[PDB]
Amino acid sequence: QQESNVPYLFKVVRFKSRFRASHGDFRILPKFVQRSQLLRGIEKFRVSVIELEPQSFMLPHHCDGEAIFVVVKGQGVIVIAEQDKNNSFNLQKGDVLRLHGGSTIFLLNADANEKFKVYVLAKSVNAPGEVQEYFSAGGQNPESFYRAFVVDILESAFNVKRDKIERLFSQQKAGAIISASGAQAAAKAGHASAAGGAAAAARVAGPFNLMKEVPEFGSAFGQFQEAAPQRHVQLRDLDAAVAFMNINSGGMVLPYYNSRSTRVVAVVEGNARFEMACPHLGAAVVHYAKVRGNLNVGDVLVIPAGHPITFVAVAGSDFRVVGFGIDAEHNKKNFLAGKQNIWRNIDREAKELSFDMPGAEVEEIFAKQILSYFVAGPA
Ligand SMILES: O=C1CC[C@@H](C(=O)O)N1
Ligand SMILES: [Mg+2]
């Protein structure tokens, strides 16, 4: 596994900036099928990262993809402008927001020191996997799409003399993410509901955050929390989930597999060693290829459904990731070792036949791990 050969691994440097901005960046990973047809089952999805430096503003624009924004660091204000409604939310770490495709948005990082980072999942509605940005704001740089219209049409549309309206669209030359003044920050944020306050909603609801809830799976060595479409209606159309997994330093998540959901995992903190069992790269008779590697901040690992996987935190940091789940509804985590695992639900005689060893002996071995989900890693 020279890593560029592991098709499920997408190193951080593979994310491509969509523009050159002074106060931040917006970078997107290539289509998942760029180097392998093994990922054709998730071809319509793209993941990206939005970074805003302190005291910055990202210009109004919309995308042709249905998105889910997850704040991984800092605080920022998102304002959404529809044809007949305005919504603004003050987002914080852990917030999850479903953004309808075609929503014109702008972002503001009002903090004086901390960067605002968002991990984004988008699903195409035009050609599979193609998601583009449409800058309504802008002029020469970023180019505003209004410049695609002839001057007589702009004049008639805006009821403004052509030279004046043309001029409006050529004043901006600073780029897509620029400096915001302290006043401007106060002004643009301020109608923004701060933990959320969706409205007593219909179309665009506010963010939700699960970081204060009890983990679905947890132990002294790690935690797993997930926003499922079963619980959050805003995620049903995309049939996506947003998972948060943290493995404490020196810990590991016990081998497990997802029953039907493919996960696009992005590292937000730390480092980890991963090992996955893949029958495709390996395998008439089936053979499981040992797909392994190391993950660093910003890297992405796609975990296909049904594939056994384990992550081992390395060095002196907890290892934290945000995972987007595709085909999420009805997905179940199946652990392969630990007190709570699938073998708890397999009878003794079946274990004996499974491993050609006395059933009580197989059970004795499977009961040695008294902990579940996350345990101390090798050392
Ligand atoms: O689909 C996407 C890509 C970028 C993000 C946005 O509109 O900022 N939505
Ligand atoms: Mg930049």
Numbering used by the authors: 5 to 287, 297 to 392
The authors write:
Crystal structure showed presence of acetate and pyroglutamate molecules bound in structurally quasi-equivalent cavities in each of the two domains of SM80.1. The overall crystal structure of SM80.1 consists of 392 residues of which the region 287–297 is structurally disordered and showed broken density whereas the core is clearly resolved. We were able to visualize a highly flexible loop region, which is otherwise missing or found disordered in other homologous vicilin structures. Further, examination of the region around the asymmetric unit in crystal structure revealed that the protein exists as a homotrimer. Each monomer also shows formation of core region by pair of β-barrels and helices protruding outward from each core to interact with the neighboring monomers, resulting in the formation of a trimer. Magnesium (Mg) ion is also present in the structure and exists at the interface of the monomers. Pyroglutamate is present in the largely hydrophobic core of N-terminal β-barrel domain. Phe30, His65, Cys67, Tyr73 and Ile109 are the residues in the close proximity and interacting with pyroglutamate in the N-terminal core region. In the core cavity of the C-terminal β-barrel, clearly evident was the presence of an acetate moiety fully buried, occupying around 187.1 Å2 surface area.
